Design a protein around this ligand. Structure first.
Ligand code: NA
Lengths: 119, 120
């Protein structure tokens, strides 16, 4: 499996944040679900700092008893699709969404995050 | 015209045949909108006709305001289709953006699961 998406998640589980950032193309972006665009585009120079923050949040939520549950990673041509949800210790869903990846030359060109929301 | 119930659903909407649109859903099919307490809100089959009527009225006013829906290509795999969408103003400002995840069963839509970008 040569997917940079698989490589990205393996890097994050190993806490190898430099290897995780290197799964993105030189012009790659990470577009989070919330922000003015709507959404917010993190450019490549911003991904290391963002990764550090989200890995910290992952560890805190894990310590608080929550867990991330991923669906099947689905690949079609140059796109990968991945559903996810974070559940608390009670099963309450804390976040649910889907990642849409666009790949180019074996690197992540776009990680585009979409979410469910409360009112 | 593709026989996929996703293609059929959008064809019926464009044709303003809202009964035909709803019948693209399985008898136990659901439409999970992006926002609600779940998070999201699950509309069951019997509630889909009333919800469809609302969004079509919203579509018609946005269309009259010069906005347009721009759909990606339907990406088909396993028992599922993925469809990105965005609503743009007459000048290209993005008003809405998201992706539909369709779970299919026996030629009907079992789940339409809507995910979105959001402003703060
Ligand atoms: Na078809």
């Amino acid at each position: 499996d040569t997917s940079p998406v698989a490589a990205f998640f393996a890097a994050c589980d190993a806490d190898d944040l430099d290897a995780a950032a290197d799964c993105f193309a030189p012009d790659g972006v990470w577009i989070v679900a919330a922000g003015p665009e709507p959404g917010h585009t993190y450019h490549r120079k911003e991904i290391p700092g963002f990764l550090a923050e989200i890995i910290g949040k992952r560890d805190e939520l894990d310590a608080a008893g929550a867990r991330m549950v991923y669906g099947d990673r689905i690949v079609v041509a140059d796109r990968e699709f991945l559903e996810f949800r974070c559940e608390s210790a009670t099963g309450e869903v804390l976040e649910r969404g889907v990642d849409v990846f666009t790949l180019r030359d074996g690197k992540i060109l776009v990680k585009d995050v979409f979410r469910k929301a409360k009112l």
